[PDB]
Amino acid sequence: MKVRASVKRICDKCKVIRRHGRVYVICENPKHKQRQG
Ligand SMILES: [Zn+2]
């Protein structure tokens, strides 16, 4: 797991989750489901 991707929410309905020093990106839009690292 290498944290180095712009996971910042893409659209307005995106949402970022905070995890063990890591982060996530869930959203209604499937193209926005990402993960920090
Ligand atoms: Zn989104």
The annotation status of 11 as a binding-site residue, yes or no, is yes
Distance 14 CA to ligand 1 centre (A): 4
Upper half-sphere CA count for residue 5 (Cβ side, 13 Å): 16
The tokens 């905070």 sit on which residue? 18
Give me the residue label for tokens 């890591």: 22
Give residue 27 CA to ligand 1 midpoint distance, Å.
5
Write down the domain spans for the chain: 1-37
What region does 21 belong to: left with phi over 0, alpha with psi -120 to 50, or beta? left
Q: What was the elucidation method? A: NMR
**DSSP of 1-37:** ----S--S--SSS-EEEE-SS-EEEE-SSGGG-EE--
Compute the distance from residue 13 Cα to the ligand 1 centre, in Å. Answer: 5
Residue 1 has, within 13 A of its CA and on its CB side, a CA count of: 10
Q: How far apart are CA 25 and CA 35, in angstroms?
A: 6
What count of residues does the chain have? 37
CA-CA distance, 18 to 25, in Å (whole number)? Answer: 9
d(CA 32, CA 25): 7
Is 27 known to sit in a ligand binding site? yes
